[PDB]
Amino acid sequence: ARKWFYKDPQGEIQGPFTTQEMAEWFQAGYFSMSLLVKRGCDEGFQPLGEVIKMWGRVPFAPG
Amino acid sequence: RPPPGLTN
Numbered sequence: 001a002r003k004w005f006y007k008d009p010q011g012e013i014q015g016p017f018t019t020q021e022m023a024e025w026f027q028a029g030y031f032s033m034s035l036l037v038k039r040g041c042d043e044g045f046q047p048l049g050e051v052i053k054m055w056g057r058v059p060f061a062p063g
Numbered sequence: 064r065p066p067p068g069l070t071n
Contacts, residue, residue, distance in 0.1 A: 008069055009068070014067045
């Protein structure tokens with residue numbers, strides 16, 4: 001399922017991406033803790049560090 | 064492929 005979005009430094013929304021695509025980019029080091037991310041169904045973009053705090057784990061991993 | 068928009 002394609003459901004992940006992020007905002008690039010120029011404010012443009014990118015997506016939708018699969019969880020596996022996000023996991024790949026996260027493990028490769030492309031995503032900082034300040035990157036604004038959300039699922040389509042979510043209310044608002046949040047920094048990835050805060051998403052991890054909210055979810056209790058990195059959201060792209062198995063749970 | 065790098066993530067669009069993040070690496071120019």
